[PDB]
Symmetry: C2
Subunit: 113 residues, 2 copies
């Protein structure tokens, strides 16, 4: 294949594979275009995953090529694609305010002047 | 591995494969425990499929091992199993009757006017 991505070093490989037998696969589900599922890794394993496999801005894993995620010891049939995030059904809208939403309004509260 | 079933001769193989580009696959669908789909063969191809691949009492193909149906040129991903038919909902009950069921009743009725000698 010629590994598309950043192949893991023999050491990296050997330390991640320790968790292989504990990786968990959810049942598949589907929509109008796709078939879906998620793989849950044992947290411990996160600690041993190279840092270039991470999204420094979020703390989650960056997108992984198939060779890469297969490299981690995650194993599944053909044609599965890794994606970063999954939007809910169109009738359901997600929200959030920063725990200190007040400080910020209070900030722009005296600001007014 | 090797081969489960009645592998096709080089002649048969060559014969059937002529239709491979015309074999059609339906979209998959699923219920609780299974995923489903069907493959539709070009009728022409039916004529060239060996006859031991058939169910003489029905005219449909007998069950096919994976190697066997792969042999026919039908190609799909892993884990697919070939089954003969789809039973209907459990509250629906199917029945059939020979078109000549009377032939036999005429026989029995007759046969009961024969050994109806019990005198």
């Amino acid at each position: 294949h010629a590994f598309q991505g950043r192949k893991l070093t023999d050491q990296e490989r050997a330390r991640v594979l320790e968790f292989q037998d504990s990786i968990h696969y959810s049942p598949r589900y589907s929509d109008d275009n796709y078939e879906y599922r998620h793989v849950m890794l044992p947290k411990a394993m996160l600690k041993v995953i190279p840092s270039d496999y991470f999204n420094s801005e979020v703390g989650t894993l960056r997108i992984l090529t198939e060779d890469e995620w297969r490299g981690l010891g995650i194993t599944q049939s053909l044609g599965w694609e890794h994606y970063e995030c999954h939007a809910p059904e169109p009738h359901i809208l997600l929200f959030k305010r920063p725990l200190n939403y007040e400080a910020e309004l209070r900030a722009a509260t005296a600001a007014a002047q």
